[PDB]
Design an enzyme around this catalytic site. Sequence first.
Site, PDB file in Angstrom:
ATOM      1  N   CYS B 111       0.807  -1.221   0.000  1.00 32.09           N
ATOM      2  CA  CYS B 111       0.000   0.000   0.000  1.00 32.09           C
ATOM      3  C   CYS B 111       0.841   1.273   0.000  1.00 32.09           C
ATOM      4  O   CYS B 111       1.639   1.516   0.905  1.00 32.09           O
ATOM      5  CB  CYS B 111      -0.966   0.028   1.190  1.00 32.09           C
ATOM      6  SG  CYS B 111      -1.982   1.537   1.250  1.00 32.09           S
ATOM      7  N   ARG B 114      -0.167   4.548   2.825  1.00 32.87           N
ATOM      8  CA  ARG B 114      -0.061   4.338   4.271  1.00 32.87           C
ATOM      9  C   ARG B 114       0.340   5.544   5.126  1.00 32.87           C
ATOM     10  O   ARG B 114       0.344   5.429   6.347  1.00 32.87           O
ATOM     11  CB  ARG B 114       0.898   3.176   4.586  1.00 32.87           C
ATOM     12  CG  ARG B 114       0.376   1.780   4.316  1.00 32.87           C
ATOM     13  CD  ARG B 114       1.489   0.773   4.613  1.00 32.87           C
ATOM     14  NE  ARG B 114       2.458   0.699   3.514  1.00 32.87           N
ATOM     15  CZ  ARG B 114       3.610   0.036   3.584  1.00 32.87           C
ATOM     16  NH1 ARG B 114       3.941  -0.586   4.709  1.00 32.87           N
ATOM     17  NH2 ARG B 114       4.427  -0.006   2.532  1.00 32.87           N
ATOM     18  N   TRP B 283      -9.297   6.199  -0.666  1.00 35.12           N
ATOM     19  CA  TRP B 283      -9.650   6.918  -1.881  1.00 35.12           C
ATOM     20  C   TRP B 283      -8.687   6.498  -2.985  1.00 35.12           C
ATOM     21  O   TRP B 283      -7.674   5.849  -2.722  1.00 35.12           O
ATOM     22  CB  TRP B 283      -9.632   8.434  -1.667  1.00 35.12           C
ATOM     23  CG  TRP B 283      -8.367   8.976  -1.067  1.00 35.12           C
ATOM     24  CD1 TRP B 283      -7.182   9.219  -1.716  1.00 35.12           C
ATOM     25  CD2 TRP B 283      -8.166   9.373   0.297  1.00 35.12           C
ATOM     26  NE1 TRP B 283      -6.259   9.735  -0.831  1.00 35.12           N
ATOM     27  CE2 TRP B 283      -6.838   9.840   0.410  1.00 35.12           C
ATOM     28  CE3 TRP B 283      -8.980   9.372   1.435  1.00 35.12           C
ATOM     29  CZ2 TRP B 283      -6.304  10.302   1.627  1.00 35.12           C
ATOM     30  CZ3 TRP B 283      -8.450   9.828   2.639  1.00 35.12           C
ATOM     31  CH2 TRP B 283      -7.126  10.284   2.725  1.00 35.12           C
ATOM     32  N   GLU B 288      -5.096   3.907 -10.795  1.00 39.54           N
ATOM     33  CA  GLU B 288      -5.841   2.678 -10.571  1.00 39.54           C
ATOM     34  C   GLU B 288      -6.980   2.586 -11.588  1.00 39.54           C
ATOM     35  O   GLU B 288      -7.298   1.512 -12.107  1.00 39.54           O
ATOM     36  CB  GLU B 288      -6.416   2.647  -9.156  1.00 39.54           C
ATOM     37  CG  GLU B 288      -5.392   2.530  -8.033  1.00 39.54           C
ATOM     38  CD  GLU B 288      -6.071   2.456  -6.660  1.00 39.54           C
ATOM     39  OE1 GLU B 288      -6.567   1.357  -6.322  1.00 39.54           O
ATOM     40  OE2 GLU B 288      -6.132   3.490  -5.931  1.00 39.54           O
TER      41      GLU B 288
HETATM   42  C1  HEM Z   1      -6.372   6.390   1.979  1.00 40.88           C
HETATM   43  C2  HEM Z   1      -6.015   6.292   0.690  1.00 40.88           C
HETATM   44  C3  HEM Z   1      -5.383   5.008   0.095  1.00 40.88           C
HETATM   45  C4  HEM Z   1      -4.692   4.991  -1.045  1.00 40.88           C
HETATM   46  C5  HEM Z   1      -4.366   6.191  -1.963  1.00 40.88           C
HETATM   47  C6  HEM Z   1      -4.264   3.630  -1.296  1.00 40.88           C
HETATM   48  C7  HEM Z   1      -3.520   3.226  -2.369  1.00 40.88           C
HETATM   49  C8  HEM Z   1      -3.282   1.913  -2.666  1.00 40.88           C
HETATM   50  C9  HEM Z   1      -2.928   1.414  -3.972  1.00 40.88           C
HETATM   51  C10 HEM Z   1      -2.757   2.277  -5.249  1.00 40.88           C
HETATM   52  C11 HEM Z   1      -2.770   0.096  -3.850  1.00 40.88           C
HETATM   53  C12 HEM Z   1      -2.409  -0.857  -4.995  1.00 40.88           C
HETATM   54  C13 HEM Z   1      -3.723  -1.580  -5.257  1.00 40.88           C
HETATM   55  C14 HEM Z   1      -3.809  -2.086  -6.666  1.00 40.88           C
HETATM   56  O1  HEM Z   1      -3.045  -1.599  -7.549  1.00 40.88           O
HETATM   57  O2  HEM Z   1      -4.671  -2.978  -6.875  1.00 40.88           O
HETATM   58  C15 HEM Z   1      -3.040  -0.295  -2.470  1.00 40.88           C
HETATM   59  C16 HEM Z   1      -2.973  -1.567  -1.936  1.00 40.88           C
HETATM   60  C17 HEM Z   1      -3.368  -1.971  -0.677  1.00 40.88           C
HETATM   61  N1  HEM Z   1      -3.891  -1.140   0.323  1.00 40.88           N
HETATM   62 FE1  HEM Z   1      -3.999   0.964   0.182  1.00 40.88          FE
HETATM   63  N2  HEM Z   1      -4.701   2.821  -0.270  1.00 40.88           N
HETATM   64  C18 HEM Z   1      -5.427   3.633   0.607  1.00 40.88           C
HETATM   65  C19 HEM Z   1      -6.082   3.188   1.745  1.00 40.88           C
HETATM   66  C20 HEM Z   1      -6.005   1.930   2.309  1.00 40.88           C
HETATM   67  C21 HEM Z   1      -6.683   1.481   3.505  1.00 40.88           C
HETATM   68  C22 HEM Z   1      -7.681   2.356   4.307  1.00 40.88           C
HETATM   69  C23 HEM Z   1      -6.322   0.203   3.737  1.00 40.88           C
HETATM   70  C24 HEM Z   1      -6.730  -0.750   4.890  1.00 40.88           C
HETATM   71  C25 HEM Z   1      -7.211  -0.312   6.072  1.00 40.88           C
HETATM   72  C26 HEM Z   1      -5.383  -0.181   2.705  1.00 40.88           C
HETATM   73  C27 HEM Z   1      -4.758  -1.402   2.612  1.00 40.88           C
HETATM   74  C28 HEM Z   1      -4.202  -1.890   1.463  1.00 40.88           C
HETATM   75  C29 HEM Z   1      -3.845  -3.273   1.255  1.00 40.88           C
HETATM   76  C30 HEM Z   1      -4.001  -4.447   2.246  1.00 40.88           C
HETATM   77  C31 HEM Z   1      -3.294  -3.332  -0.162  1.00 40.88           C
HETATM   78  C32 HEM Z   1      -2.791  -4.620  -0.856  1.00 40.88           C
HETATM   79  C33 HEM Z   1      -3.844  -4.942  -1.916  1.00 40.88           C
HETATM   80  C34 HEM Z   1      -3.701  -6.343  -2.432  1.00 40.88           C
HETATM   81  O3  HEM Z   1      -2.658  -6.995  -2.147  1.00 40.88           O
HETATM   82  O4  HEM Z   1      -4.634  -6.812  -3.136  1.00 40.88           O
HETATM   83  N3  HEM Z   1      -5.207   0.893   1.855  1.00 40.88           N
HETATM   84  N4  HEM Z   1      -3.348   0.852  -1.775  1.00 40.88           N
HETATM   85  C1  LIG Z   2      -2.141  -9.455  -9.833  1.00 43.22           C
HETATM   86  O1  LIG Z   2      -3.286  -8.728  -9.377  1.00 43.22           O
HETATM   87  C2  LIG Z   2      -4.449  -9.381  -9.024  1.00 43.22           C
HETATM   88  C3  LIG Z   2      -4.683 -10.671  -9.495  1.00 43.22           C
HETATM   89  C4  LIG Z   2      -5.852 -11.331  -9.135  1.00 43.22           C
HETATM   90  N1  LIG Z   2      -6.752 -10.733  -8.342  1.00 43.22           N
HETATM   91  C5  LIG Z   2      -6.557  -9.492  -7.871  1.00 43.22           C
HETATM   92  C6  LIG Z   2      -5.402  -8.786  -8.195  1.00 43.22           C
HETATM   93  C7  LIG Z   2      -5.200  -7.382  -7.655  1.00 43.22           C
HETATM   94  C8  LIG Z   2      -5.813  -7.206  -6.265  1.00 43.22           C
HETATM   95  C9  LIG Z   2      -6.473  -5.834  -6.135  1.00 43.22           C
HETATM   96  N2  LIG Z   2      -6.070  -5.068  -4.933  1.00 43.22           N
HETATM   97  C10 LIG Z   2      -6.909  -3.858  -4.990  1.00 43.22           C
HETATM   98  C11 LIG Z   2      -6.846  -2.854  -3.855  1.00 43.22           C
HETATM   99  C12 LIG Z   2      -6.693  -3.154  -2.498  1.00 43.22           C
HETATM  100  C13 LIG Z   2      -6.676  -2.132  -1.538  1.00 43.22           C
HETATM  101  C14 LIG Z   2      -6.797  -0.805  -1.941  1.00 43.22           C
HETATM  102  C15 LIG Z   2      -6.787   0.242  -1.033  1.00 43.22           C
HETATM  103  C16 LIG Z   2      -6.935   1.546  -1.513  1.00 43.22           C
HETATM  104  C17 LIG Z   2      -7.045   1.788  -2.882  1.00 43.22           C
HETATM  105  N3  LIG Z   2      -7.151   3.046  -3.393  1.00 43.22           N
HETATM  106  N4  LIG Z   2      -7.059   0.753  -3.729  1.00 43.22           N
HETATM  107  C18 LIG Z   2      -6.935  -0.513  -3.291  1.00 43.22           C
HETATM  108  C19 LIG Z   2      -6.970  -1.528  -4.230  1.00 43.22           C
END
Ligand code: HEM
Ligand SMILES: COc1ccncc1CCCNCc1ccc2ccc(N)nc2c1
Lengths: 408, 413
Positions: B111, B114, B283, B288
């Site tokens: 993320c 953070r 947000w 994305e």
């Molecule tokens: C507040 C604004 C936030 C922004 C701008 C943001 C941004 C991002 C982005 C761009 C990713 C990559 C996701 C992707 O490309 O699919 C990500 C991943 C992630 N975020 Fe954040 N995020 C935010 C909030 C949060 C919150 C509130 C949480 C949890 C409480 C969180 C937990 C995670 C986790 C666990 C991932 C890993 C996703 C995965 O492995 O599928 N994020 N975040």
């Molecule tokens: C290789 O990628 C994949 C393959 C299969 N399934 C799913 C995926 C990607 C998983 C999507 N993770 C998507 C995500 C998680 C947390 C977020 C928190 C904030 C934010 N702005 N965007 C998030 C977007």
Amino acid sequence: RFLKVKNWETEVVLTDTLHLKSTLETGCTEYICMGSIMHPATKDQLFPLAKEFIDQYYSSIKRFGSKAHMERLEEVNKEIDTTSTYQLKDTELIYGAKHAWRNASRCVGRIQWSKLQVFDARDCTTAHGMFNYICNHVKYATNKGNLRSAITIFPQRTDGKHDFRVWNSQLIRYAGYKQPDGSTLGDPANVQFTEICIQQGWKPPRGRFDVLPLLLQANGNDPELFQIPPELVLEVPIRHPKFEWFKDLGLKWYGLPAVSNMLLEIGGLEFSACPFSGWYMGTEIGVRDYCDNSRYNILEEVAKKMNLDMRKTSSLWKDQALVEINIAVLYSFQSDKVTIVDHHSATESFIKHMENEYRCRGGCPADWVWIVPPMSGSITPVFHQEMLNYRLTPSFEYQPDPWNTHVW
Amino acid sequence: CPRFLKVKNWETEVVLTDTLHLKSTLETGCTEYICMGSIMHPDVATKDQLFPLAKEFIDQYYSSIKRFGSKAHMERLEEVNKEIDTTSTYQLKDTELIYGAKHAWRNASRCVGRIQWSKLQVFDARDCTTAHGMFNYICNHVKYATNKGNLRSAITIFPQRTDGKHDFRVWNSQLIRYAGYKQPDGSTLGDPANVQFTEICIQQGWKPPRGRFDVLPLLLQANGNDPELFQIPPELVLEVPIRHPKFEWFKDLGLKWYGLPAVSNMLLEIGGLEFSACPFSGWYMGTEIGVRDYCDNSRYNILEEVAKKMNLDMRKTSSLWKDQALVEINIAVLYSFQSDKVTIVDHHSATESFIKHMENEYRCRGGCPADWVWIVPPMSGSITPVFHQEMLNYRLTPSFEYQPDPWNTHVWK
Ligand code: HEM
Ligand SMILES: COc1ccncc1CCCNCc1ccc2ccc(N)nc2c1
Ligand code: HEM
Ligand SMILES: COc1ccncc1CCCNCc1ccc2ccc(N)nc2c1
Ligand SMILES: C[C@H](O)[C@H](O)[C@H]1CNc2nc(N)[nH]c(=O)c2N1
Ligand SMILES: C[C@H](O)[C@H](O)[C@H]1CNc2nc(N)[nH]c(=O)c2N1
Ligand SMILES: [Zn+2]
């Protein structure tokens, strides 16, 4: 265990067995991954390494356990005894060099791996000799714009006190100069090397694109300066196909990327001087060389000429200018009939290469951090390709800069 | 392992020192001989497994509030230990639940957002017993987080796993997503990523409008029961029509997107407790939507259409027509959100903020686990500061984890 890698766009799944062959460490452990870290003999160490290499060589030519194979091991073992080292056969030298490239996990160009012109320079004894071998390399590889992959290999390390080294990081690079007002003229990446050349007697033109001299060290002696004959240095004036003002930026670059500071390791032997060259992927110049903040750093100037709103990042003025610069580089090289590959074409070829390697070899070590281009990542197929990284030998390795080791 | 690992930034030459990796609790997938850093993913706890996991967390909680070794610490430890003995599980205090959720986010190596980790509204839904109740909690979440466009990060936490036959699950991957419909001719209407889930919804009774941007219904499983369908009140779903500040024709593409990214299929692990339904939202970073949702070939895949409207030469890849249209699309996305006053962040600002965050974490925490493959944006990588930043990746707990899709494991009643 067999490991599988999935492409998330095509859903193709490949199965890796080749990793089971690796014995060198990657730097990661079960608890910490160092995938984005830049970098994480004796007779007794020598023989097993030699044997391993001879073995895979005779395996590759389908004569494992043959009379030639047995005699070669015998010959090598004996030679390590009497001399504390050994000499590769020419066939082995070529096989090893091609495989070092093949095994280079960071290289997106490896579809070409078996087309490598290998120049044996192991009879070289002096810096003048190195210069001769290097000129021939540059002339052969440039080929009037039809670039050809090549490598020149100088004598292997003996005791560490008599290394052959190319002090330049590439054979052809531009000088960088520290200005009194604290700014930098030319390439900031090379300011240190430039100062060293000046200190050793090079007379700098103090321009933005001054081709550096060669600084060549043979047999552990002090390095000596040479000027590459300019007719051997192919360069491309950068222009844009739509923006007629782009030429007015006065940008150029050299056609031949020729990395000269790496170490080639084969069968335990170490080749501290092995300049090799292929051709450019456009982003290398258009994105990194031109647009890195610590490099030529041209975005703001280009964005100005494009009259972009540069008050806010979210206008993406940087991104727009980035694309136009890379269009220009591709166009310029193409217009001058100088070999270059765009990151779309290159990544496709790499994906095809990966399939080939999985099919014929059981895998392909690949460093996603390096393979994915520094612009437009996810619109290229490699972004979506899971990769396994592991170290196979023969290989190219980094080594310390010679000015941190050498005694004068 | 070595006590001190250094990371370097190759643009600024700044060197950071990591000690926090010593607190690593789980496996990366990597070994000393292979790196799996680009691999996407590299029945309940027994009493004896649960004890050390709980103590680890409780210790960490009381250490964070500067009451380590205190009477309240030792007592809480004793109460937890006793509860595990008599019931083979335990219940977190509200304070611990809040700390745990925030830290799962703080620990999320993938993320880039953070810097915000400590501003997270936590909704305790552990009293929920039915899918209708889950629907109530989710609506309240959506409304609070949306906030008329001034988005606020939030998580809603449903009851933890007990025997594994009573899991609460949100079957949706995000609370708000668009349906995808596979056509007889092989084409896909809507979002191709969501075809399977959409099919499941239709099978469960949902009547599809069969449009390009149909908000999917909620499919909500409480206490291990069969999941149930609910329609999110449309007024709770904030959306942004995509237009471009220069290209007047861009609006004629008919693109829009929703304001609130709210991931709902992850598992939150705290002190060895498993919260299988814990939807959270922040947000968007513009890329994305503009790069992945819109330009992935297996998604909306609009590059060609935009390029045609831009009158670009599309016969050669080396014209970079794709790269050119990609930028314009991302400009449009950022412009449309800012114009409608819906919180969004561009990849430049987000990556710069993350570098500051990471540096502060290194100074105050002794490290910040980061997944470079995920942190670097899907466009313009090297012109963001994160590209040049060496990172160490490792797994700290509390954490967010992937879990299997519920339709694969559900015992239908
Ligand atoms: C507040 C604004 C936030 C922004 C701008 C943001 C941004 C991002 C982005 C761009 C990713 C990559 C996701 C992707 O490309 O699919 C990500 C991943 C992630 N975020 Fe954040 N995020 C935010 C909030 C949060 C919150 C509130 C949480 C949890 C409480 C969180 C937990 C995670 C986790 C666990 C991932 C890993 C996703 C995965 O492995 O599928 N994020 N975040
Ligand atoms: C290789 O990628 C994949 C393959 C299969 N399934 C799913 C995926 C990607 C998983 C999507 N993770 C998507 C995500 C998680 C947390 C977020 C928190 C904030 C934010 N702005 N965007 C998030 C977007
Ligand atoms: C023939 C056309 C080639 C192309 C288009 C190509 C492309 C690339 C690119 C774009 C990189 C990333 C380097 C960077 O971003 O700084 C790379 C890395 C690398 N290439 Fe290739 N390459 C080619 C040929 C070769 C050859 C002939 C060799 C050696 C015989 C080679 C060995 C390597 C090695 C060892 C790396 C890793 C560099 C490092 O770790 O610093 N490549 N290649
Ligand atoms: C984090 O990255 C660094 C940090 C410090 N020094 C250097 C680096 C990058 C090293 C640059 N390697 C640069 C290279 C090597 C082989 C090539 C082969 C073909 C080609 N077209 N380009 C190459 C370009
Ligand atoms: C920190 C990070 O490892 C470093 O910036 C790497 C990232 N990926 C790269 N990829 C390529 N092709 N070339 C590079 O120099 C780098 N640099
Ligand atoms: C194969 C590769 O690991 C996969 O495509 C990853 C790469 N990096 C990513 N980074 C982000 N932010 N989001 C992603 O979905 C992915 N996908
Ligand atoms: Zn790793």
